[PDB]
Design a protein around this ligand. Structure first.
Ligand SMILES: [Cl-]
Ligand SMILES: [Cl-]
Ligand code: NA
Ligand code: NA
Length: 599
């Protein structure tokens, strides 16, 4: 009576009577699937048609959807108290597809993904909602992938006898040939047959999946999932993550500074033994949390750090966290500062206090387009713009990491291969960036991110230098140690898409001159700071050149290691030209920059 069989009755099309109360259907999948020894993703979907605008649906109490015709509200999760909550604003009227992904495997993520596809009259995919993440924990995920109940009830319906029409209800499973990198990014869509081509179109790049998911095999387990023809609005793929107990800025900073998935920080259970999480992740998360609690305006990060390092035992808990890892503290706090500032300047309703707990919206950004903008409803969120990073262009040779002993598994041979791969993907070398070890990890793997800087706002941006000898001066820590030793850093190679070259300008005017600002603004055609453009000019009168990439452009760079090593025995010394591999020099000429504004 109240029960129904979703995958039998609604695989093609069903009309469910809701006039007598909630309707329910058990969703059971072979337990052998949830207990697989490899990795996979169960993709549950259904198309909701007539009656989809006055409905409250739920999978157990784990996931609940409320659709009133204007929005689709989603909430749930395993944790009590305030649940994980999201709200999607309908961009169309009509049918929409409900989708949720449940990962399976022994080292799987502990959350599910949920997304909506709005469909037009012709059953074409017209709009896709952000991909929402809801924390479930391992046991509830097992339950969601074995036996859960689907509930549907009418909600504020204007119908005398409300009904809900469902079509193409079903579940499929994709098995990989363990990496879950795609899961947290826009590439998660590349794992779903029904979405074939969506990533290529929206990201304007091939999925280029690694072997694991490249050789995936998919099977429909029940029902008859829909595969809609596309007619989607050109909107970048986005993810949204809500932090019920706050601390989003801290998690975002840890994720970007350490190159750790964002969702690691929203896990029901903390991972154990994860070295990078224990040494970088949690410490950075804690550092940002401490700074926010001290109610210090992010504009004083530099002084807060100087004071903490100047007098031991000062600054309280925040001061001590800083002293424990100076450089990591500089990286984390300056990254958090820059993001909070952007957040506050986003809208009138955003303030420094709110940046600490705002949802995180992550965008899959095309590198050739203009600036990467988030959806209309992302104005109240922290934003992350993601582009290909050095992590994708290291080539073969084993894990790469930065150390005082040098860059692991990095040789001139490997570099030449990576450089060719970069050319094949449309990138071009524009210079060197020298920095400390933690920043190198962040930049190469996680990607370049804006950081607050102590200089006039108009000159804010990512600083690089065509001459490795100039960049070398910055490839180190900027503070001695208890043993009177400063760690050596790493020299990095910065690349940008060739399509970005028209935005690179040059001036013979020392960027330190009085009329510098005006001349650069004349060249770039807009007021500073730099946006999707760059300026190269002498660092000082009669000196070597420096290049500044506006942050928007900096984010779309690909940065990889240089084969030019830093010297642990001569930190502070000048680059020994004899240490520069001749073959690296051969791939280090710089592009021809524009000396006049565009006409
Ligand atoms: Cl109910
Ligand atoms: Cl060489
Ligand atoms: Na309604
Ligand atoms: Na719930």
């Amino acid at each position: 009576e109240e029960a129904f069989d979703l995958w039998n009755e609604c695989a093609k099309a069903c009309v469910l009577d809701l006039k007598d109360g909630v309707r329910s259907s058990r969703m059971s999948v072979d337990p052998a699937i949830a207990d697989t020894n490899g990795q996979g993703v169960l993709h549950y979907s259904m198309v909701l048609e007539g009656g989809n605008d006055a409905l409250k649906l739920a999978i157990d109490n784990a996931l609940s959807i409320t659709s009133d015709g204007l929005t689709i509200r989603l909430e749930g999760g395993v944790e009590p108290n305030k649940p994980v909550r999201y709200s999607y604003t309908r961009q169309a009227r009509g049918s929409w597809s409900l989708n949720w992904l449940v990962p399976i495997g022994h080292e799987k993520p502990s959350n599910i993904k949920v997304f909506i596809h709005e469909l037009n009259a012709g059953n074409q995919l017209s709009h896709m909602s952000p991909i929402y993440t809801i924390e479930m924990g391992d046991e509830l995920l097992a339950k969601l992938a074995r036996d859960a109940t689907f509930f549907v009830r009418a909600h504020e319906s204007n119908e005398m006898q409300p009904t809900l029409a469902i079509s193409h209800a079903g579940v499929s499973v994709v098995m990989a040939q363990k990496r879950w990198s795609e899961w947290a990014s826009g590439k998660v869509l590349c794992l779903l047959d029904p979405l074939d081509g969506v990533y290529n179109y929206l990201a304007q790049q091939r999925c280029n999946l690694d072997d694991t998911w490249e050789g995936k095999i998919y099977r429909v387990l029940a029902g008859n999932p829909a595969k809609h023809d596309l007619d989607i609005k050109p909107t970048v793929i986005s993810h949204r993550l809500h932090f019920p107990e706050g601390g989003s800025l801290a998690a975002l900073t840890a994720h970007q500074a350490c190159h750790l998935p964002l969702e690691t920080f929203t896990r029901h259970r903390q991972p154990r033994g994860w070295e990078q999480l224990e040494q970088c992740g949690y410490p950075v998360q804690r550092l940002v949390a401490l700074y926010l609690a001290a109610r210090l305006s992010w504009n004083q990060v530099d002084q807060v750090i100087r004071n903490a390092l100047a007098s031991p035992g000062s600054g309280g808990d925040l001061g001590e966290a800083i002293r424990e890892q100076p450089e990591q503290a500089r990286l984390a706090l300056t990254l958090a500062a820059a993001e909070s500032e952007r957040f506050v300047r986003q809208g009138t309703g955003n303030d420094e206090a709110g940046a600490a707990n705002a949802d995180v919206v992550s965008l899959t950004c095309p590198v050739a387009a203009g600036e990467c903008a988030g959806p209309a409803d992302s104005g109240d969120a922290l934003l992350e713009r993601n582009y290909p990073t050095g992590a994708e262009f290291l080539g073969d040779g084993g894990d790469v990491s930065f150390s005082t002993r040098g860059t692991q598994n990095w040789t001139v041979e490997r570099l030449l291969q990576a450089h060719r791969q970069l050319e094949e993907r449309g990138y071009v070398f524009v210079g060197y960036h020298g920095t400390f070890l933690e920043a190198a990890q962040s930049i190469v793997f996680g990607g370049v991110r804006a950081r607050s800087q102590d200089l006039d706002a108009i000159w804010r941006g990512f600083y690089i230098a065509g001459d490795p000898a100039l960049a070398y001066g910055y490839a180190q820590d900027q503070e001695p140690d208890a043993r009177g030793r400063i760690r050596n850093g790493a020299l990095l190679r910065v690349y940008v898409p060739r399509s970005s070259l028209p935005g690179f300008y040059r001036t013979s005017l020392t960027l330190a001159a009085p009329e510098a600002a005006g001349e650069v603004e004349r060249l770039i055609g807009h007021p500073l700071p730099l946006r999707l453009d760059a300026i190269t000019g002498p660092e000082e009168e009669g000196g070597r050149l420096e290049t500044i990439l506006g942050w928007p452009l900096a984010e779309r760079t690909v940065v990889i290691p240089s084969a030019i090593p830093t010297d642990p025995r001569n930190v502070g010394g000048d680059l020994d030209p004899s240490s520069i591999p001749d073959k690296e020099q051969a791939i280090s000429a710089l592009p021809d920059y524009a000396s006049q504004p565009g006409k």
